[PDB]
Write a new protein. Structure first.
Lengths: 605, 470
């Protein structure tokens, strides 16, 4: 019960207790109102997620301008399968979440102090965002009366919801501070890339001037630069230069050289510059956190006898910082009592310790692992069947109980704390409960059986080699969350733009559609006609198989080359920057894991 | 200046100048006959290169079986534009390059001394390769005459020419030696990748078992694993799961998760393992180089006037090697990186090109001849739908450009499907699978790591220069 002890010691503890708490919470990274607001922090978090999720269910703007047919003909408009809110439902949940937001944003005035509240920038920006949302909601509500407005051309709330979400979750804000560091360096390598495309497409344009390649593909410098930009992604390779190769096999040399330089040099040079600037900005950022950590330690200090008394609390300035950092890096945190040591003859009778050693024994692991292999054999045999399967319900139940027992013995040997502190044990816990629930409810099957397959990953987890890769993966998964969230918020902004600009054109009546590559390649459900559909289309533009099919199709559907600016800017922001950041993160992760085991060896030697 | 003074000093100079030559050539990184051998290096190189390029102009063997129509109707077989040598020319250039190769491979027999030469296994393997070439050339000559043979099923010379070329250039031979060590680590992450595909494809097959995705795309576990393997490359995205998305939009959650894990995690992990194991082998190589340089300098030492006479020649036991080491002394950063990276990368791009040569030779023997205007099946294939028919294996250039197209991983499954359906045998996929495993997941990831290392070296170098000037 750490958090309650901490908050009690902070609010009511004696100065030595307060100091000990301040240092403990430094090691772990009006105070009553702050604690209350922290307890409400779950409510605030869920409200901010619901505030963003409203974008998925709000009815698309183009449905309001009286389409014929109505948007109920989701086949005619190739629309999604999520529902769209009525106006009534939208006004209900928009009102509830805006009211909770106003409460959330202004409640800190009760404890921060107004001079602080207005001196602080993050406050002023959140006040601006909530004001903008209040205005746009009140406008959209007043439009319930036709006297209020005749027409509404555009809507701003879909963007401000995302901004408020970004400003609410600090780790996203610190990721955007990092990114708005490295962006200035990134513009130089982006410029060198552009200048390379310009030159290469000028050479191509001169070289093919009167060939069939010129006359049917490189018809002008602009089309050349565009086709070459696509070919830098290689997505149109070899298709874009087949006419050249038909006219002279030697033409292949120019395109092989262009692809080779583009894919293996420049793409990697951009990656290297992004990786460098990431590493620089991350080291710069973390140094600021270490400095704040010192500021907190200096407060804990300011609040031989003093050293003895602090070490006495530990039994539960430069000297202080050194001692605290040393003991922190040297020693693990204090033990947590079980609920069961209170029973001497139960918990402490040597039969207990003997069973504890047994469950801890290696041969117990050998037994359980062999049983798990047998469970794998059991399920692989069972999936040969689809009433003959009925007896395998017995095997299902038996393995269910076996996992209940294993989990129980695990908590019997590592409590709740050292059990749940291990991510493997957490996965065990979850899959145990879900399958035990399924089986005890049994005693749709084809779908729930995928959980019985999912449990088989334990066979990989046990492997002495792969455990290193799996540990890299398991630490990387939570560590990537804010960068994936940054990408997802950019996708939300881009989808909103797509829904407003391109939504509604992909319908069965638009005869131009059946001229597009979408209708030729059958991609028709990957339209922007609603937010879900745009969101999955944007996943396709991210992995960017066939991505130019959309850029061509919507160029042709809109009739202006400016439609391309959406996909070009999307490529520049997501692929060339943010995803290369994620790549750098994975490389730093694995090499840190290798460095960590190299340190473990060097210190053990 | 330098090279003449060095060889002159080594052959005729005073021993103090001989030491000076040894140290100067160490700074710059019967000996008369070794000097002749070294000066001929250009002729040796050009002979090896001609022997390698011979594969581009040797007539494809399936034409020698006399098809109808003949390979004179190049359009009917979508053939390239390079000449095919006559039997006369092929015999002439094979004999000439064999004679010059025999000369080169025997040339060290004098200056190395027979026991030493034949003791060194690199000579022995070269001799095995050259004897194989001699035997196969003699067989090819006999096969000109009906008395010796009626037919020969398989021709080995196209491979051994590449093997001899790899053995001949030290920068290549050391590149493949470096590469051969990390393979034992590369096979582990390859096992993890295989196990991942197998399990993910099993979940896919059972999840969709009765759906339209199952009833059209994932019809058997085999088809599932194949389609998922292509989807790991992302090259069949979104195509493979459009039926699932038509039946229920929630299907997309599984394929999005599969692609995300495949790309941004596992492939990057394969890059990380290859990168680290390369950096390990590079470190071992450069440590071996430093050790060898020291051993040479120690020999040069073995040969106060002591100092003065050397400081005199320098105008051109550790104590000596340490002396030698002492007496050895916006876009600009990117552009310097790019400039130096090219002559640094030449070994690896060259090795990749040699692997393509082996694969192209296999391609011309196994698949060559299938893509022709009379093949009724061909017009059912994706090759014909996408008008890719010039990208075939009917001659060596065509195969080489097809192999480049696979190396860029553009539409690469078109050929794998089309040639599977042409060859009528699922085993044809092994060509493209093994190619992807060897070139993309290993060698080109190595190239990536080499580029990144070059860039970070350039940033460190300019930071060092700045800090030392500060």
């Amino acid at each position: 019960t750490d958090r309650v002890r901490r908050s009690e010691a902070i609010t009511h503890g004696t100065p030595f207790q307060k100091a000990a708490a301040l240092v403990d919470l430094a090691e772990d990274g009006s105070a009553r109102y702050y604690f209350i607001f922290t307890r409400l922090d779950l409510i605030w978090s869920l409200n901010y997620f619901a505030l963003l999720f409203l974008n998925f269910f709000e009815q698309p703007l183009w449905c309001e301008k009286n389409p014929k047919p109505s948007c109920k003909d989701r086949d005619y408009y190739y629309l999604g399968e999520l529902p769209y809110l009525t106006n009534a439902e939208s006004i209900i949940y928009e009102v509830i979440t805006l009211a909770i937001l106003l409460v959330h944003t202004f409640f800190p005035i009760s404890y921060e102090g107004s001079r602080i509240f207005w001196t602080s920038r993050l406050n002023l920006v959140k006040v601006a965002c909530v004001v903008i949302l209040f205005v746009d909601v009140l406008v959209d509500f007043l439009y319930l009366s036709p006297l209020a407005f005749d027409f509404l051309p555009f809507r701003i709330a879909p963007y401000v919801r995302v901004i408020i979400f970004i400003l609410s979750i600090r780790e996203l804000r610190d990721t955007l501070v990092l990114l708005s560091g490295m962006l200035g360096t990134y513009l130089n390598i982006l410029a060198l890339w552009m200048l390379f495309l310009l030159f290469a497409s000028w050479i191509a344009f001169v070289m093919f001037e009167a060939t069939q390649q010129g006359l049917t593909v490189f018809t002008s410098y602009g089309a050349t630069l565009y086709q070459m930009f696509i070919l830098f992604t290689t997505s149109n390779n070899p298709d874009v230069w087949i006419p050249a190769y038909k006219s002279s096999r030697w033409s292949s040399v120019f395109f092989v050289l262009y692809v080779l330089i583009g894919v293996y040099f420049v793409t990697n040079l951009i990656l290297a510059v992004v990786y460098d600037s990431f590493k620089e900005q991350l080291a710069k950022q973390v140094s600021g956190m270490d400095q704040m950590k010192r500021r907190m330690l200096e407060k804990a200090f300011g609040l031989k006898n003093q050293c003895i008394k602090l070490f006495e609390q530990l039994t539960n300035k430069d000297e202080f910082a050194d001692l605290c950092q040393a003991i922190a890096l040297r020693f693990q945190k204090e033990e947590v009592p079980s609920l069961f040591e209170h029973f001497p003859q139960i918990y402490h009778s040597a039969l207990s310790q003997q069973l504890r050693a047994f469950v801890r024994s290696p041969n117990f692991g050998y037994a359980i692992s062999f049983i798990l292999i047998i469970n794998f054999i059991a399920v692989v045999v069972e999936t040969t069947l689809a009433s003959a399967q009925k007896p395998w319900q017995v095997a299902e139940f038996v393995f269910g109980w076996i996992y209940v027992l294993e989990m129980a013995l695990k908590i019997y040997t590592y409590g709740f704390e050292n059990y749940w502190r291990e991510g493997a044990n957490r996965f065990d816990f979850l899959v145990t409960w879900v399958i035990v629930i399924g089986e005890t409810a049994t005693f749709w099957i084809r779908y729930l059986l995928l959980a019985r397959m999912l449990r088989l990953i334990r066979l990989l987890m046990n492997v002495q080699r792969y455990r290193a890769f799996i540990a890299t993966f398991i630490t990387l998964i939570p560590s990537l969350m804010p960068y994936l969230g940054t990408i997802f918020c950019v996708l939300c902004i881009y989808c909103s733009i797509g829904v407003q600009v391109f939504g509604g054109l992909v319908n069965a009546g638009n005869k131009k559609l059946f001229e597009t590559e979408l209708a030729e390649d059958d991609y028709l459900l990957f339209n922007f006609n609603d937010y879900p559909n745009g969101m999955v289309t944007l996943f396709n533009l991210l992995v960017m198989g066939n991505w130019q099919v959309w850029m061509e199709s919507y160029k042709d559907l809109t009739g202006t080359w400016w439609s391309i600016t959406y996909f070009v800017s999307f490529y520049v922001i997501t692929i060339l920057l943010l995803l290369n950041l994620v790549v750098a993160f994975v490389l730093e992760a694995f090499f840190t894991e290798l460095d960590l085991e190299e340190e473990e060896k060097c210190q053990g030697q």
